[PDB]
Write a protein that binds this ligand. Structure first.
Ligand SMILES: CN1C(=O)C[C@@H](c2ccccc2)Nc2ccccc21
Length: 126
């Protein structure tokens, strides 16, 4: 079996910014989710080979994970906060699409998403 290449985290011809909203997304939002007891499945791309999930990347065509988001934030990959918020939402959605209601992983994603929503509710004005 084979994993796909990970999402890109570097692209020199993509225009970039470091806005106060993006700073908040790193220092408050990512940091909060990263340290959570349920973060670990989301801290790197889904390894479909070692999890024995040969259908994962058949079903999930827009992979995203917090390891990727962390790298994107640390390397100032984004132009705006909405791009990054979309990445978090892609990560959660992927989990709900692939897995079954009530599965441990879904409970984990739901706990992280609750915190995510609480933090982005107070996203600072630009
Ligand atoms: C984020 N993630 C998954 O969505 C896969 C899920 C899983 C389902 C069935 C069998 C094995 C794993 N849980 C999971 C576990 C570890 C890392 C990522 C995931």
């Amino acid at each position: 079996s084979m994993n796909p290449p990970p999402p890109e985290t570097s692209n020199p011809n993509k225009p970039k910014r470091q806005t106060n909203q993006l700073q908040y997304l790193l220092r408050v939002v990512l940091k909060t989710l990263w340290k959570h007891q349920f973060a670990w499945p989301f801290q790197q791309p889904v390894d479909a080979v070692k999890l024995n999930l040969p259908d994962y990347y058949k079903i999930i065509k827009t992979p995203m994970d917090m390891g990727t988001i962390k790298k994107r934030l640390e390397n100032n990959y984004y132009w705006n906060a909405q791009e990054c918020i979309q990445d978090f939402n892609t990560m959660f959605t992927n989990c709900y699409i692939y897995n079954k209601p009530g599965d441990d992983i879904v409970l984990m994603a739901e706990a992280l998403e609750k915190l995510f929503l609480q933090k982005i509710n107070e996203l600072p004005t630009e």
